[PDB]
Amino acid sequence: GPLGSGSEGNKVKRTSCMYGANCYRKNPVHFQHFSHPGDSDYGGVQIVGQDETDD
Ligand SMILES: Nc1ncnc2c1ncn2[C@@H]1O[C@H](CO)[C@@H](O)[C@H]1O[C@H]1O[C@H](CO)[C@@H](O)[C@H]1O
Ligand SMILES: [Zn+2]
């Protein structure tokens, strides 16, 4: 089962990044391989402020 074919330029549902909410690194091609919170294709939703923001 060979793999290794994930490349999204700017028109596909990119995979959320390992730390999209805090992705400290930033490259010109990394944004195409991983999506991030704040973009139209983000899709990670890993418990980011469930319901504790009432202050
Ligand atoms: N908040 C945050 N954003 C991105 N990457 C992050 C992170 N918190 C931790 N990491 C990565 O996980 C390990 C800790 O187990 C760190 O060393 C980070 O690894 C990064 O290092 C690579 C480049 O040196 C990156 O590709 C990423 O894996
Ligand atoms: Zn990232």
Curated annotation (Swiss-Prot):
A zinc finger (PBZ-type) spans 15-36. It comes from the Eukaryota. Residues 44-54 are annotated as: Flexible linker. Disulfide bonds: none annotated. Poly-ADP-ribosylated. In addition to binding non covalently poly-ADP-ribose via its PBZ-type zinc fingers, the protein is also covalently poly-ADP-ribosylated by PARP1. A glycoprotein binds at R14, Y19, Y24, R25. It is found in: Nucleus; Chromosome; Cytoplasm, Cytosol. Belongs to the APLF family. Interacts with LIG4. Interacts with PARP1. Interacts with XRCC4. Interacts (via KBM motif) with XRCC5 and XRCC6; promoting recruitment to DNA damage sites. Interacts with XRCC1. Interacts (via C-terminal disordered region) with histones; interacts with histone H2A, H2B and H3-H4. Histone chaperone involved in single-strand and double-strand DNA break repair. Recruited to sites of DNA damage through interaction with branched poly-ADP-ribose chains, a polymeric post-translational modification synthesized transiently at sites of chromosomal damage to accelerate DNA strand break repair reactions. Following recruitment to DNA damage sites, acts as a histone chaperone that mediates histone eviction during DNA repair and promotes recruitment of histone variant MACROH2A1. The PBZ-type zinc fingers (also named CYR) mediate non-covalent poly-ADP-ribose-binding. Specifically recognizes branched poly-ADP-ribose chains generated by PARP2. Poly-ADP-ribose-binding is dependent on the presence of zinc and promotes its recruitment to DNA damage sites. The KBM (Ku-binding motif) mediates interaction with XRCC5/Ku80 and XRCC6/Ku70 and recruitment to DNA damage sites. This is Aprataxin and PNK-like factor. It comes from Homo sapiens (Human).
